[PDB]
Every structure is written in C-alpha cells, then in structure tokens.
From a paper:
The triazole analogs **C3TD343** and **C3TD078** were found to have favorable permeability (MDCK P_app_ > 2) and measurable free fraction of ∼2%. Encouragingly, however, the triazole **C3TD343** was readily brain penetrant and displayed an order of magnitude higher rate of permeation than **C16** (K_in_ > 50 x 10^-^ mL/s/g, **[Fig fig2]**). We proceeded with a dose-escalation experiment of **C3TD343** in mice, which revealed a dose-proportional increase in brain exposure after IP administration using 10, 30, and 100 mg/kg (**[Fig fig2]**). At 100 mg/kg, **C3TD343** achieved a total brain C_max_ = 2.4 μM and AUC = 2.9 μM*hrs, yielding a moderate P:B = 0.25. Representative data for a potent compound (**C3TD078**, K_d_ = 2 nM) and a weak compound (**C3TD343**, K_d_ = 200 nM) are provided in **[Fig fig4]**. On exemplar triazole, **C3TD343**, showed robust passive BBB permeability, but it was not efficacious in an intracranial xenograft due to a combination of low potency, rapid hepatic clearance, and Pgp- mediated export. The S4-truncated **C3TD343** does indeed cross the BBB, but like the other reportedly brain penetrant analog **HBI-2375**, it is too weak (K_i_ = 5 nM) to have pronounced functional effects in cells: a similar 2,700-fold shift would imply an unfeasible transcriptional IC_50_ > 13 µM, well above the brain exposures achievable with **C3TD343** (C_max_ = 2.4 µM at 100 mg/kg).
Genetic and pharmacological evidence suggests that the nuclear scaffolding protein WD-repeat containing protein 5 (WDR5) is a therapeutic vulnerability of the CSC population. Previously reported WDR5 WIN-site inhibitors contain a tri-substituted amide core with an Arg-mimicking “S2” group, which penetrates to the bottom of the WD40-domain central cavity, and two additional “S4” and “S7” substituents that make interactions with pockets along the surface of WDR5 (chemical structures in **[Fig fig1]**, binding pose in **[Fig fig1]**). Herein, we report the structure-guided development of a novel series of triazole-based WDR5 WIN-site inhibitors designed to increase passive brain penetration. These triazole-based inhibitors potently inhibit WDR5, maintain a conserved binding mode in the WIN-site, exhibit passive permeability, and, in some cases, improve brain penetration.
Residue numbers in the entry: 33 to 208, 215 to 334
The structure:
C-alpha cells in the first residue's frame, strides 16, 4: 500500500480519543477529551458539526448500523445516544459507577455495550435506554468491548490480562500483560487483541489458538485502537506510541508501511468501509485527525 496524507482535521482542543467512519462511508465521527463530538466529511475532511452535552471528556464514540445514531462513553460515568442529524441527545445511559471507556452498537443496533473503569460490562437497550444486563466482567478497568457479526457474542478485554467472550442473550461467559484492545475480525471468526508488551495477536477463538503475531510498534502505556483493513490488501492497522501509524500484511506479518506525520501518540485509527482510506488521531501535543489515502 502507499497511504499518503491527504487532509489534517483541526478542531479539538484536547486529546482526540477515538475516530470512527460511518457505515455508509459518508462521515467521520471523532470524540475528544475536550468533551465534544465532531463530525467531518469522510472523503474531504470538511468539518460538519460539533455535538455537545457531556460534562467531562469522552473516551469513545460509535455509529449505529444505519449511520443515524451515535453513542459516546464519557468520564461523567454516562453514555449518551445522539441523533446525528439533529445533534440532540436522545438518551443518557446511567448506571456505571466510574468512567465509561469504550462502547459499541450491535449489528442490529438495538443494543449498546459499554466497558468502564468500574470493571463491569453493561448491555443497554437503545430504545428505552434501560440497562438490560451488568456483567462482572473483569477485575480491572475494561479496555474494549465489541459485538460479533450477528450480535450474539461480546468480546471484552481488560488490564487484568484477560480476554473474555460473552453470550449477549444470557450475559454468561463462554470462553476466557494487560490486554489493551480487542475486536472481532470482519468474517467474525478471529479476534485481534493488543497487549501492552508491544504486541498484536490474531486469535481463532473457536479453536482458542493464536494464529499470527504482529510486532514492530511501541505499545506499553495506552489502549490503542487496531483495525482490519479489507477494502484493498488485507492489512492490520494500528496506532503507536512512537507517533506512527503501523500497517502489517495480515498474512505475512510484515510491516508494509509506517505513516509519519502525527506529533503525539497515535491513539486511534479507523479504516473506511469501502475506500482505501485511513483516519488517525493523536494525543494532546497534536490534537488533529489525519486522513490518508492509498491506491490499493
Ligand atoms: C483502560 O484502563 C486503564 C487506562 C489507563 C490510562 N489510559 N490508557 N489508554 C488510554 C488511557 C486514558 C487516555 C486514553 C486512552 C486510550 C484512548 C483510546 N481509546 C479510547 C477508548 N478506547 C480506546 C482504545 C483514548 C484516551 C484519551 C485521551 C484521549 C490506565 C490504567 C488503566 C487500567 N487498569
């Protein structure tokens, strides 16, 4: 791949915590420690709107499947469901007793999953805003939560060193260095997990075996988003504490590109759903989002 910087997105006044493309590929949403959500054009980076209401910084944001809603996780111990068109807060999800770190819709987007520093995973009903289940998931802050492709499964990770798979319908656990990020692969059969020994590993969870290991980057202090890039060549994409975006060949485990430009830890990366486009975001010495594009 030949990812090249195309746009730098300026607006946040503190660290950018997460960037996520909308499923229709039209928009990029960003969350920040400055308590704001900002929406940008996915292809040109043009600022669109600021969405405000959280009383403390935001660690994560995520899109509903139809690209109409957002959910945000905030240090004010709540999540908020937003109507992106109107910018209005539809619901405020209360129940966590500490910072909410991570969040996601299920594919049907009738549920929300959240991970918190209170060490629980919570499952929320989008329509009523009610908390349906509270899982005593870990013995340390929860670093990531993600649904599989039909929402029947939740994968969570934690600084306690564990990665666990949960049955959404019952809340019960199906399967078990700090684990700082996890997410299901696009086909649903693998789990990409990051640990704070500068390592990413691809796990076949049905077999419970580690298939591939990716090294080269620096990840010892922060929880960093990683991604499967599938629009062109099959890559693993992740941020790094050396201010670079790393891209690995999924199959060969070779580093094939390092995207240079950010001036602080690259804490978030995201891959566009149909075009060879990467978005990346950095901590408070940088505060900008960058859009990178590749011919393949
Ligand atoms: C999750 O538990 C722990 C956390 C930490 C500190 N610490 N470590 N990483 C991040 C942070 C906080 C800062 C941050 C981080 C990570 C992200 C990226 N981000 C957000 C949601 N999900 C992800 C991968 C964003 C930010 C915000 C400044 C913008 C220390 C101990 C434990 C435990 N026990």
């Amino acid at each position: 791949p030949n990812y090249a910087l195309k746009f730098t997105l300026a607006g946040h006044t503190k660290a950018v915590s997460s960037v996520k493309f909308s499923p229709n590929g039209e928009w990029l949403a960003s969350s920040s420690a400055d308590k704001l959500i900002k929406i940008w054009g996915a292809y040109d980076g043009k600022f669109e709107k600021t969405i405000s209401g959280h009383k403390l910084g935001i660690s994560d944001v995520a899109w509903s499947s139809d690209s109409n809603l957002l959910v945000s996780a905030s240090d004010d111990k709540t999540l908020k469901i937003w109507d992106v068109s109107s910018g209005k807060c539809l619901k405020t999800l209360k129940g966590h007793s500490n910072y909410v770190f991570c969040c996601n819709f299920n594919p049907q987007s009738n549920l929300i999953v959240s991970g918190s520093f209170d060490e629980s995973v919570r499952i929320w009903d989008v329509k009523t805003g009610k908390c349906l289940k509270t899982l005593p998931a870990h013995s340390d802050p929860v670093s990531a939560v993600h649904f599989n492709r039909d929402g029947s499964l939740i994968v969570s990770s934690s600084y306690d060193g564990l990665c666990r798979i949960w049955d959404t319908a019952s809340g019960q656990c199906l399967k078990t260095p700090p684990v700082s990020f996890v997410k299901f692969s696009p086909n649903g059969k693998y789990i990409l997990a990051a640990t704070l020994d500068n390592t990413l590993k691809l796990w076949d969870y049905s077999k419970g075996k580690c298939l591939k290991t990716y090294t080269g980057h620096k990840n010892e202090k922060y929880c960093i988003f990683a991604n499967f890039s599938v629009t062109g060549g099959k890559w693993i994409v992740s941020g790094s504490e050396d201010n670079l975006v790393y891209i690995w060949n999924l199959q060969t485990k070779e580093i094939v590109q390092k995207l240079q430009g950010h001036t602080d830890v690259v804490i978030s990366t995201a891959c566009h759903p149909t075009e060879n486009i990467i978005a990346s975001a950095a901590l408070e010495n940088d505060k900008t989002i960058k859009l990178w594009k590749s011919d393949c």
